[PDB]
Design a protein around this ligand. Structure first.
Ligand SMILES: O=C(O)c1ccc(COc2cccc(Cl)c2Cl)o1
Length: 114
């Protein structure tokens, strides 16, 4: 059962990494513009219930990938199924720091299920 949890997190991790890898490259002309948008970051992200903070930013994440031209739909399903009122850090981040943050979170939980 925690096997299913771990596999779901791995799928989350890979999906988030595919997005980051997709946008964070010089073959992407819209990168500079994409980095102007602000993403809100979890005040704390140490438990699965903290994924609420991710779920609440999936729509803007989608919008910014949109206005720069699904994985998101799959991420949304995984997040809902893995997943408390969300507390956000005071300073916002770029789409790249946002993704890197939730990639680290995902890797962290995965390791505590090994
Ligand atoms: O339909 C989806 O998007 C969906 C359902 C579960 C998941 C997470 O990934 C998984 C987790 C656990 C098992 C399996 Cl076989 C998959 Cl593919 O994605």
């Amino acid at each position: 059962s925690t096997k299913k949890t771990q596999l779901q997190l791995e799928h989350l991790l890979l999906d988030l990494q595919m997005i980051l890898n997709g946008i964070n490259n010089y073959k992407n002309p819209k990168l500079t513009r994409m980095l102007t948008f602000k993403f809100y970051m979890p005040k704390k992200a140490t438990e699965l219930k903290h994924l609420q903070c991710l779920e609440e930013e999936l729509k803007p994440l989608e919008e910014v990938l949109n206005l720069a031209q699904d994985l998101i739909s799959n991420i949304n399903v995984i997040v809902l199924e893995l997943k408390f009122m969300c507390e956000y850090a005071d300073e916002t981040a770029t789409i790249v720091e946002f993704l890197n943050r939730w990639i680290t979170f995902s890797q962290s939980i995965i390791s505590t299920l090994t």
